[PDB]
Amino acid sequence: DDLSGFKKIKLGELELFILTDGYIHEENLISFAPRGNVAELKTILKDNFRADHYIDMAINILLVKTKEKLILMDTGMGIFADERTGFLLKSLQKAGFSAHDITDIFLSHAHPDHIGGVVDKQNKLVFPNASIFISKIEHDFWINASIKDFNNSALKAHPERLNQIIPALQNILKAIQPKLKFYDLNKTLYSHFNFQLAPGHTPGLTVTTISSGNEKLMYVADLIHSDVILFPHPDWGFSGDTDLDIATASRKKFLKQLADTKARAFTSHLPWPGLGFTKVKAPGFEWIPESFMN
Amino acid sequence: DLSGFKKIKLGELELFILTDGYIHEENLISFAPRGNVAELKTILKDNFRADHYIDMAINILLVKTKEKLILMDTGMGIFADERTGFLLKSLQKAGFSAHDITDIFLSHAHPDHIGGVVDKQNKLVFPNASIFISKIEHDFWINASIKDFNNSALKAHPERLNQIIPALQNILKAIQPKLKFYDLNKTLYSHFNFQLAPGHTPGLTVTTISSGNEKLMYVADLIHSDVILFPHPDWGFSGDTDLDIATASRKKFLKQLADTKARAFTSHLPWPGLGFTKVKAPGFEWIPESFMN
Ligand SMILES: [Zn+2]
Ligand SMILES: [Zn+2]
Ligand SMILES: [Zn+2]
Ligand SMILES: [Zn+2]
């Protein structure tokens, strides 16, 4: 019933806490990977002993405790939560923290399942002491977004949904304006964090690298939404991508980079705890989850 | 603090996977006696694992039925090092004390499974629990000698065997008054069925847990590495009492799991030890169960 939880890991100087907001039970598989083969999609699910009539997407969130900061990377569904989501604050509590402890929030992008937790249902800030970072491009996009921005998206099939969600996101952006900062894409922040754009899923989707000594972790957020489908088939796309073609280009760039460098990634939506490695495997890539003893 | 638990549902049953900690094997030469370190290291690197040690989990299953609370194996207990012996802390996190346990099912009598049944004064840790073991397993360790290990990698360590055998015998003596032998031909407590998978030890017992439409197979020490011993089950494991019999059992039960697409629970594969088996000729592949939390 209570879907909250955390996992603590060490990253050199840093303490990391992986938090869960819950999960998304996606039952509409015809458009999950819009450019894919729906027979092959279900074969892959069954070859991995999973259900073939839905895909459960995790909502994994990273909390980073540095020497003087406590940083939350994304905030889950918040006001958009259903009964399977909105567990972030319970997870944070289990990890030993309350909302007032958070000093900084890094938003990877402004989708409902990432920005929803920054306010409550009266548009009041949840994290009273936190600066909130977003890319300038991401902000610029959503404050003026409309239906016609989604013509290269599977979402174009849902204009009524879009016409609901866009003003809701705009209202959140208005509420957080007094806390808002834009990433500097060319400077290290707080000694540990570097930011770069990976456009396509949204125009300003930001990937964060966390560094301590010879340890690096890349939070790639919504670059990829399925371990078993979109690593071998990155050109199949994802239902929520704002621009399918541009999202495919970013997905391929970062998968290639993760494979070439053997770097560990943290992901929003792959199975818990969302940590793993990327290898080339014709005709695409393969996700190798990190292994744990507990 | 390496303690922790995961709760899952199986039909009407509540299952809690508990950790005792982990075993850090820092020398790869002994790990898979009929393999080789170059090929082993290649597999570890190919899976982004450390290439100079292997960590083995110690996963333990707690089953809450409508009238009983069953612990399947007990971790290192009196044999614990700094990374093991966390079972009671995990049990507490899951919501239970030692006094709550009604039954313990031992898969086999190795130190990392039977060590937790007594304390260092050889007093029972679980005062209200019956303890089950296979008759063959019991009779082996009561009567074992060094020569019985001549088809084990453990034959390289006769001093260690001469310490371990009496230590295990002392535990078997302490739990004697609570000890029952499995009936391999009947369902116990409406949920449990037992069968042997000899070789790792002569009386290694595999337990099937069932409720409603669901079944889970606790295969205990059938297999010790997900990435090594599924593709190469004939490489063996350092702790197997008889390497040839253990290989045959390993291949038999991996084939059954593959053919039936059944879920297994394992003592030593990465946390939480749950997963599926697929043929990947000439061997197998482990597909860990995927979770949202
Ligand atoms: Zn998104
Ligand atoms: Zn998302
Ligand atoms: Zn054993
Ligand atoms: Zn064992």
3-state secondary structure A18-57: EEEEEEEEECCCCCCCCCCCHHHHHHHHHHCCCCCCCEEE
Chain centroid to Cα A143, Å, comes to 20
Dihedral of CA atoms A135, A136, A140, A145 in degrees, nearest 10, equals: -10
In the chain, the amino acid numbered B71 is L
Q: Residue A181 is part of a domain; what is its CATH number?
A: 3.60.15.10
B60, B89 in Cβ contact below 8 A?
no
CA of A281: which chain B residue's CA is closest? B46
Instruction: Give A270 to chain B, closest Cα distance, Å.
Output: 8
Contacts of B38 (CB under 8 A, 6+ apart): none
Measured CA distances, B268 to A102, A201, B30, B77, B273 (Å): 37, 39, 17, 16, 7
Cα–Cα distance between A35 and A282 in angstroms, integer?
18
Candidates B276, B216, B213; CA nearest to A45 is B276
Q: How far apart are CA B254 and CA B222, in angstroms?
A: 9
- For residue B204, give the ligand nearest its CA: 3
What is the DSSP pairing of strand B179-181 with strand B283-288?
A: unpaired
Number of domains in chain A: 1
- Chain-centre distance for alpha carbon A135: 14
Of B225, B276, B227, residue with least CA distance to B254: B276
CA distance B19 to chain A (A): 7
Cα A275 to Cα A3, A18, A291, B46, distances in angstroms: 19, 9, 9, 16
Centre of ligand 4 to C-alpha B119, Å, is: 19
Cis peptide before A203 (omega within 30 of 0): no
Angle separating helix axes A136-144 and A159-175, nearest 10 degrees: 120
Range of the domain at A72: 1-294
Could you give the dihedral angle defined by the CA atoms of residues B106, B107, B111 and B116, in that order, rounded to the nearest 10 degrees? -30
Nearest Cα residue to A86 out of A22, A16, A144, A150: A22
The token pair that represents B275 in the structure block: 């997963």
Residues of A in contact with B292 (CB under 8 A): 3, 20, 22-23, 56, 58, 271-272
Residues in a beta bridge with B272: none
- Say whether B48 and A262 touch across the interface (CB within 8 A): yes
Task: Name every chain B residue with its beta carbon within 8 A of the beta carbon of A48.
Answer: 287, 290
Sort out which chain A residues have CB atoms less than 8 A from B21's CB and list them: 293-294
Q: Do A293 and B22 touch (CB under 8 A)?
A: yes
Bridge partners of B274?
Answer: B265
Contact in structure between B149 and B241 (CB atoms under 8 Å): yes
Inspect the interface and report whether the beta carbons of A272 and B291 lie closer than 8 Å: yes
Compare CB distances from A272 to B48, B278, B292 and report the shortest one's residue.
B292
Sign of torsion over alpha carbons B4, B7, B10, B11: positive
* B103 vs B191: CA distance, rounded Å: 13
Ligand nearest to the CA of A201: 1
A130 Cα distance to chain centroid: 19
**Helix, strand, coil percentages for chain B (3-state, nearest 5):** 30, 30, 40
Q: Count of alpha carbons within 13 Å of A119, Cβ hemisphere only?
A: 19
- Cα separation, B271 vs B288, in Å, equals 9
Q: Ligand nearest B23 Cα, by number?
A: 4
Q: What is the dihedral of CA B32, B37, B38, B41, to 10 degrees?
A: 80
Q: How far is CA B174 from CA A185, B69, B87, B270, in A?
A: 66, 22, 20, 32
Give dist(CA B46, CA B48) in Å, integer. 6
Report the alpha-carbon distance of residue B226 to residue B34 in Å, rounded.
17
B residues 158-187 lying closer than 8 A (beta carbon) to A: none
Put simply, the answer to whether A293 touches B270 (Cβ < 8 Å) is yes
Does A261 touch chain B if contact means CB atoms closer than 8 Å?
A: no
Residue B235 near residue B35 (C-beta atoms within 8 A): yes
CA distance A15 to A9: 6
Tell me how far apart the alpha carbons of residues B127 and B171 are, in angstroms, rounded to a whole number.
15
Bond from prior residue into B272 cis (ω within 30 degrees of 0): yes
What is the torsional sign of CA B69, B90, B275, B31? negative
Provide, as residue numbers in chain A, all residues whose Cβ is less than 8 Å from the Cβ of B270.
291-293
CA distance A23 to A4: 10
**Nearest residue to B253 via CA among B287, B222, B221, B208:** B222
Angle formed at CA B171 by CA B166 and CA B172, multiple of 5 degrees: 95
Q: Which helix (H) or strand (E) holds B250?
A: helix B243-260
Q: A94-99: long-range contacts (C-beta < 8 A, 24 or more apart)?
A: A94/A4, A94/A5, A94/A6, A95/A6, A95/A8, A95/A17, A95/A19, A95/A63, A97/A63, A97/A70, A99/A126, A99/A127, A99/A128
Provide the sign of the torsion angle of the four alpha carbons A29, A30, A33, A37, taken in this order.
positive
CB A148 within 8 A of CB A162: no
Residues 6-45 of A with CB under 8 A from B: 20, 22-23
Quick one: which of A17, A24, A25, A5 has its CA closest to A89? A5
Q: Which helix (H) or strand (E) holds B87?
A: helix B87-94
Closest CA to A289 of B270, B81, B206: B270
Q: Is B224 annotated as a binding residue?
A: no
Tokens for B116, please give them: 């937790």
Residue of A nearest to B86 (CA): A294
Resolution of the entry in angstroms = 1.1
User: Are B83 and B2 within 8 A, CB to CB?
Assistant: yes
Q: Which residue of B lies nearest to A269 if distances are taken between CA atoms? A: B292
Euclidean distance between CA atoms B63 and B71, whole angstroms: 7
CA distance B57 to B224: 9
Q: What distance in angstroms lies between residue A40's CA and the mean position of ligand 1's atoms?
A: 24
- State the nearest Cα–Cα gap between B47 and chain A, in angstroms: 7
- DSSP alpha helices (H): ranges in A72-223? 88-95, 112-115, 136-144, 159-175
Those residues whose C-beta lies under 8 Å from the C-beta of residue A31, and which sit 6 or more positions away, are: A154, A157, A239
- In angstroms, rounded to a whole number, what is the distance separating the alpha carbons of residues B116 and B74? 5
Q: Are A114 and A268 spatial neighbours (Cβ–Cβ below 8 Å)?
A: yes
Distance CA A261, CA A278 (A): 9
